[PDB]
């Protein structure tokens, strides 16, 4: 994994959102609170 609780609490590079599953991206499945985004989230 890349970030979040699945990767030692790491933040994503380049201000990307960390999804609920520990992967870095920029779309709703990664960034939305409705999808349990972990960090660098949108709204």
N, CA, C and O atoms as a DFTB+ gen file, in Angstrom:
172 C
 N C O
     1  1       0.871      -1.193       0.000
     2  2       0.000       0.000       0.000
     3  2       0.887       1.215       0.000
     4  3       2.107       1.058       0.029
     5  1       0.353       2.418      -0.030
     6  2       1.113       3.650      -0.154
     7  2       0.996       4.650       0.968
     8  3       1.890       5.470       1.176
     9  1      -0.129       4.583       1.708
    10  2      -0.395       5.603       2.687
    11  2      -1.363       5.141       3.737
    12  3      -1.976       4.078       3.641
    13  1      -1.482       5.980       4.748
    14  2      -2.523       5.729       5.711
    15  2      -2.242       4.599       6.673
    16  3      -1.098       4.189       6.871
    17  1      -3.318       4.102       7.269
    18  2      -3.107       3.090       8.290
    19  2      -2.535       1.788       7.775
    20  3      -1.983       1.001       8.545
    21  1      -2.660       1.554       6.483
    22  2      -2.097       0.383       5.823
    23  2      -0.614       0.589       5.490
    24  3       0.036      -0.338       5.006
    25  1      -0.075       1.775       5.737
    26  2       1.321       2.070       5.422
    27  2       1.961       3.000       6.440
    28  3       2.621       3.981       6.095
    29  1       1.742       2.657       7.712
    30  2       2.361       3.380       8.790
    31  2       2.022       4.817       8.975
    32  3       2.786       5.576       9.572
    33  1       0.867       5.207       8.464
    34  2       0.413       6.562       8.588
    35  2       1.046       7.542       7.631
    36  3       0.925       8.759       7.765
    37  1       1.735       6.956       6.648
    38  2       2.356       7.837       5.689
    39  2       1.426       8.742       4.906
    40  3       0.303       8.330       4.616
    41  1       1.824       9.939       4.551
    42  2       1.097      10.848       3.683
    43  2       1.504      10.547       2.238
    44  3       2.615      10.075       1.996
    45  1       0.635      10.811       1.301
    46  2       0.897      10.664      -0.098
    47  2       1.800      11.797      -0.579
    48  3       1.750      12.908      -0.050
    49  1       2.618      11.512      -1.578
    50  2       3.388      12.606      -2.171
    51  2       2.425      13.479      -2.969
    52  3       1.300      13.086      -3.278
    53  1       2.909      14.679      -3.291
    54  2       2.211      15.614      -4.091
    55  2       0.778      15.964      -3.734
    56  3      -0.069      16.216      -4.590
    57  1       0.545      15.968      -2.416
    58  2      -0.749      16.347      -1.911
    59  2      -1.918      15.502      -2.370
    60  3      -3.070      15.936      -2.339
    61  1      -1.606      14.285      -2.798
    62  2      -2.685      13.377      -3.209
    63  2      -3.470      12.899      -1.994
    64  3      -2.969      12.848      -0.871
    65  1      -4.713      12.554      -2.270
    66  2      -5.568      11.980      -1.221
    67  2      -5.240      10.521      -0.952
    68  3      -4.958       9.762      -1.880
    69  1      -5.277      10.128       0.317
    70  2      -5.097       8.731       0.679
    71  2      -6.445       8.085       0.897
    72  3      -7.187       8.445       1.811
    73  1      -6.754       7.114       0.033
    74  2      -8.028       6.428       0.109
    75  2      -8.151       5.580       1.383
    76  3      -7.182       5.329       2.100
    77  1      -9.390       5.156       1.620
    78  2      -9.681       4.306       2.759
    79  2      -8.923       2.988       2.755
    80  3      -8.810       2.340       3.795
    81  1      -8.403       2.579       1.604
    82  2      -7.657       1.328       1.468
    83  2      -6.152       1.482       1.393
    84  3      -5.424       0.503       1.230
    85  1      -5.686       2.724       1.514
    86  2      -4.269       2.985       1.537
    87  2      -3.582       3.284       0.229
    88  3      -2.382       3.037       0.103
    89  1      -4.291       3.805      -0.745
    90  2      -3.741       4.119      -2.059
    91  2      -3.908       5.602      -2.351
    92  3      -4.884       6.213      -1.917
    93  1      -2.970       6.184      -3.078
    94  2      -2.957       7.606      -3.358
    95  2      -3.621       7.947      -4.681
    96  3      -3.316       7.313      -5.690
    97  1      -4.504       8.911      -4.713
    98  2      -5.194       9.319      -5.914
    99  2      -5.876      10.649      -5.736
   100  3      -5.728      11.309      -4.707
   101  1      -6.630      11.040      -6.756
   102  2      -7.209      12.375      -6.827
   103  2      -8.685      12.459      -7.174
   104  3      -9.234      13.548      -7.344
   105  1      -9.316      11.311      -7.277
   106  2     -10.742      11.230      -7.591
   107  2     -11.564      10.946      -6.334
   108  3     -11.015      10.708      -5.258
   109  1     -12.870      10.975      -6.487
   110  2     -13.765      10.765      -5.347
   111  2     -13.474       9.518      -4.520
   112  3     -13.527       9.575      -3.291
   113  1     -13.168       8.396      -5.160
   114  2     -12.955       7.180      -4.354
   115  2     -11.735       7.329      -3.439
   116  3     -11.599       6.584      -2.469
   117  1     -10.855       8.277      -3.737
   118  2      -9.701       8.488      -2.893
   119  2      -9.851       9.647      -1.929
   120  3      -9.327       9.624      -0.816
   121  1     -10.587      10.676      -2.384
   122  2     -10.655      11.960      -1.712
   123  2     -11.877      12.352      -0.927
   124  3     -11.842      13.279      -0.117
   125  1     -12.972      11.634      -1.172
   126  2     -14.212      12.008      -0.535
   127  2     -14.413      11.475       0.867
   128  3     -14.104      10.314       1.136
   129  1     -14.925      12.299       1.765
   130  2     -15.257      11.772       3.101
   131  2     -16.303      10.660       3.051
   132  3     -16.361       9.818       3.947
   133  1     -17.125      10.658       2.006
   134  2     -18.164       9.640       1.857
   135  2     -17.534       8.272       1.607
   136  3     -18.138       7.237       1.891
   137  1     -16.311       8.281       1.070
   138  2     -15.519       7.093       0.806
   139  2     -14.423       6.904       1.857
   140  3     -13.453       6.186       1.613
   141  1     -14.567       7.536       3.014
   142  2     -13.658       7.319       4.132
   143  2     -12.200       7.654       3.762
   144  3     -11.274       6.937       4.141
   145  1     -12.019       8.741       3.027
   146  2     -10.660       9.229       2.757
   147  2      -9.915       9.403       4.069
   148  3     -10.471       9.890       5.054
   149  1      -8.651       9.000       4.070
   150  2      -7.821       9.071       5.274
   151  2      -7.028      10.342       5.458
   152  3      -6.840      10.783       6.592
   153  1      -6.549      10.954       4.369
   154  2      -5.743      12.148       4.516
   155  2      -5.705      12.924       3.205
   156  3      -5.943      12.362       2.136
   157  1      -5.405      14.222       3.293
   158  2      -5.352      15.166       2.213
   159  2      -6.676      15.113       1.457
   160  3      -6.683      15.178       0.228
   161  1      -7.795      14.997       2.168
   162  2      -9.112      14.862       1.567
   163  2      -9.731      16.162       1.057
   164  3      -9.317      17.260       1.430
   165  1     -10.731      16.004       0.198
   166  2     -11.538      17.060      -0.417
   167  2     -12.898      17.100       0.276
   168  3     -12.992      16.515       1.355
   169  1     -13.956      17.724      -0.226
   170  2     -15.276      17.744       0.389
   171  2     -16.283      18.394      -0.561
   172  3     -17.463      18.508      -0.227
